[PDB]
Amino acid sequence: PKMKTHRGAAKRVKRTASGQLKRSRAFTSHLFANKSTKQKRQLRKARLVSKSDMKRVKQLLAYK
Amino acid sequence: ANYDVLKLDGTKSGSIELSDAVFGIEPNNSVLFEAINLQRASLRQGTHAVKNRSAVSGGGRKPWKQKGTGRARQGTIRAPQWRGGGIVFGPTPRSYAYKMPKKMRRLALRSALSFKAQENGLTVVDAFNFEAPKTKEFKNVLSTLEQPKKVLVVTENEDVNVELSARNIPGVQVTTAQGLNVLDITNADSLVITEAAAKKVEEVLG
Amino acid sequence: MKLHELKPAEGSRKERNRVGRGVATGNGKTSGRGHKGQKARSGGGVRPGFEGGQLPLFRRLPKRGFTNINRKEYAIVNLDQLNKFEDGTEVTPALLVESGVVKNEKSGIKILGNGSLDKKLTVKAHKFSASAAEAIDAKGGAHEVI
Amino acid sequence: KQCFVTGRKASTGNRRSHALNSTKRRWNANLQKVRILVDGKPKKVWVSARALKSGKVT
RNA sequence: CAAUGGUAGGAGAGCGUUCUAAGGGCGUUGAAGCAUGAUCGUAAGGACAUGUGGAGCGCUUAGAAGUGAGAAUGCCGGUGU
RNA sequence: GCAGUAAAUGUGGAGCCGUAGCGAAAGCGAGUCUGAAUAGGGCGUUUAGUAUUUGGUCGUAGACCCGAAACCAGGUGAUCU
RNA sequence: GACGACAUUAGACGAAUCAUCUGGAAAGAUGAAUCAAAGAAGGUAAUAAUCCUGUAGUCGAAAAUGUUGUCUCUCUUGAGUGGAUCCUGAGUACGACGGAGCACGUGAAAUUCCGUCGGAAUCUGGGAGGACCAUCUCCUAAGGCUAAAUACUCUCUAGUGACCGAUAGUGAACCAGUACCGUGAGGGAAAGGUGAAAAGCACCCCGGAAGGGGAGUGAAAUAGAACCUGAAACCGUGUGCUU
């Protein structure tokens, strides 16, 4: 039948123009007293899913 | 371009002009082949099926205990290795038809009608005029027109008497101008089109 | 081409790889699945995204954002896509739908500015960008927002 | 065990726990045995206490 | 002029079995099977002759698959020690 | 869906993909987001896509075959004990 | 009830081929014809459009049915305008507690149900528009009936199949849910093929018989009833070369 989508993932990544996936960052919910001011604005950004993980999850997000 | 119009007798009457965008293109053998495969696949009423290990009668009891007997471990008398057991992955009821883009379907009818106009197998006749069904007379017409054992006759709309006359001549099929199909034009070694059907086929296919 | 001499298009067809039929084929005994483990079993393999119990990527990462159930996104027509019309000619959304430059009016029409006019004409759309406005007015012609 | 007037009867559902663990349960009507006038001649029958809230003659 | 051991494994080219479409053929002046033979190709394999056999079956091109067995203490049937 | 022969095919243009991306969003647009910046940086911008289909994989299906210890529902049984 | 109309549970008619060759027999081969609204198909001593049953086409019911045109027949009020009053579905809506359902986990559950307690309004009203309200828009619950498009095939009728051809295809092509097994629920097999025609071997010989060997039937009897073809494992009898 029609293949489904990892709904848990569709809420975490936006698809970018060259087919990349823009992801949000980790280590950013609490315990900020234990992380530096440098770590915090360099975590206030967006990175791309690394190609190794892309090879792992290509189909979980095929319809995005 | 200009094909000779003959009478049912074979004597030249007039001449008609069929376009080269319909009856004179360079045949695409890649598109014509895919269209022939499609039609032959679409004709398969696949109604072929077998029974797997769930549909064979009975077979629910472990035939013997798992350990202790010296026999191989078995779970049903209807397993695939058993005589009388379920089939693994055989035929299942399915269809075989597919589709091609519309424009490609049109280049395949044109390509078949252009092959049968390069090999000189397109005889445009003026009309047909059969006022009652008689087969012996349709054989006389196709022999006086020197048409090969295999010919496809094309009328304008449904011509009841022309159809009832060629149903039994072995090797002749009768088709309307809209019901032209590739498998039929490509089997036929010769064509015989009514001038009205020839102007209709130029309008529709180009 | 004759029905008894036909040929398929070159390189268009290929015979598929039957597995588990003799050693010579190169996929004889194990059918290309190695020796043991889940990969070697029927219906085996592992669910995609699974990482051997390691926390999967898409739970290491946080969700963000929402969806504004009511978006106004428009079928966009670029500046250079308007030089398929003519001079002075009074284009409209219906006219450009007929011309087929827009396959469907999604929630309106938006003119953006990329190329050039080479023309002088009036327009009537739903929304415009600044560049569209100056690019139309430079050559002359109005833009009646509807 | 139905009421001869309304029809309020028993119904099944789930006893749920704090951990949302479910067990099947039932809900019965407050059926009371009362002597009412069935077709004139008095007779004892089960009738709900909501049907006796207002409307029944014992 | 250089290269050619090879297992898990990747790639390519192919040989065979049944059926279908078309074309072209063979068949009581003996088909398919079966048996024998000292024959041909690089291999999967292909012919030819002679016997038994008493009716169907090849070849070319292309399509589809219940397509290839030596092992599963495999299943069924025969026959050994 | 309709016509058609259980075919081709014709008709059917809701939809579907692409021609513009950026941002959580409002929104803006060859730019956009962060930001006070006209800084810097992220993603873009230099057109090529789409329909069908052969092949390779993967998902959902029992999904290469065989094989448990076992679980649950409805029945049968105190002629042995 | 009373008249018709096609269709369906028997059926009827239905074109056109002869000769030679090989053969046990031709439908084959060869030559010369013919019909076709019929060259679908199955038979026939081999492979048949013209031999047979049929096919295309046409025709056809005493009756007993579905079906349908009508004729009856049986039923029977259609509107507007005011609007002062009146009426418009109660233990109901709905709320609280506890549950189910709705893609959505007593929860916002509004939409919606069930149990337990409460419990309303009557147009100057009531419900809905995803907590929600105010306003707007839509609707008018708590009574009832309703064909079509839709799902399925124990059957029956006609037909189709790049579906199986007896370890396949139904378990079952064959007296099969039967031998058989079990106290019972149940479980469950194996097993088609002489030839064209039974022409199924008159008599004789050995033998008690089973068998056999002649003769005869047949194209063929290593086609003789366990009967078409008859592989391999396996068992024999000879021997050329070896030990």
Curated annotation (Swiss-Prot), chain A:
One Pfam match: Ribosomal_L35p
GO process annotations (BP): translation
InterPro entries: Ribosomal_bL35 (IPR001706), Ribosomal_bL35-like (IPR021137), Ribosomal_bL35_CS (IPR018265), Ribosomal_bL35_sf (IPR037229)
DNA damage recorded as keyword: no
Keywords noted in UniProt: Ribonucleoprotein, Ribosomal protein
Family: Belongs to the bacterial ribosomal protein bL35 family.
Record's protein name: Large ribosomal subunit protein bL35
Organism: Staphylococcus aureus (strain MW2)
Curated annotation (Swiss-Prot), chain B:
Domain of life: Bacteria
GO biological process: translation
UniProt entry keywords in alphabetical sequence: Ribonucleoprotein, Ribosomal protein, RNA-binding, rRNA-binding
Claim: RNA-binding is one of the keywords in the record: yes
UniProt key word Ribosomal protein: yes
Pfam families, per database record: Ribosomal_L4 (PF00573)
Start and end residues of each stretch annotated as Disordered: 49-75
UniProt-recorded Gene Ontology molecular function terms: rRNA binding; structural constituent of ribosome
GO-annotated cellular components: ribonucleoprotein complex; ribosome
Record note on quaternary structure: Part of the 50S ribosomal subunit.
Family: Belongs to the universal ribosomal protein uL4 family.
Primary role: One of the primary rRNA binding proteins, this protein initially binds near the 5'-end of the 23S rRNA. It is important during the early stages of 50S assembly. It makes multiple contacts with different domains of the 23S rRNA in the assembled 50S subunit and ribosome.
Name the record gives this protein: Large ribosomal subunit protein uL4
Species annotation: Staphylococcus aureus (strain MW2)
Curated annotation (Swiss-Prot), chain C:
Alphabetical keyword list: Ribonucleoprotein, Ribosomal protein, RNA-binding, rRNA-binding
Annotated GO CC locations: cytosolic large ribosomal subunit
SUPFAM superfamilies registered for this protein in UniProt: Ribosomal proteins L15p and L18e
Gly residues bias spans: 42-52
Spans annotated as Disordered: 1-54
Signal peptide feature range: none
Keyword Lipid metabolism on entry: no
GO molecular function, one term: rRNA binding
Record GO biological process: translation
Keyword RNA-binding on entry: yes
Pfam family, one: Ribosomal_L27A
Biased composition (Basic and acidic residues): 1-18
Subunit record text: Part of the 50S ribosomal subunit.
Purpose: Binds to the 23S rRNA.
Matching NCBIfam families: rplO_bact
Family listed: Belongs to the universal ribosomal protein uL15 family.
Protein name: Large ribosomal subunit protein uL15
Chain's gene name: rplO
From Swiss-Prot, chain D:
Region called Disordered, residue ranges: 1-20
Pfam families in UniProt: Ribosomal_L28
Gene Ontology molecular function terms on file: structural constituent of ribosome
A GO-annotated cellular component: ribonucleoprotein complex
Single GO biological process annotation from the record: translation
Organism: Staphylococcus aureus (strain MW2)
Protein name: Large ribosomal subunit protein bL28
Keywords, alphabetical: Ribonucleoprotein, Ribosomal protein
Entry's family note: Belongs to the bacterial ribosomal protein bL28 family.
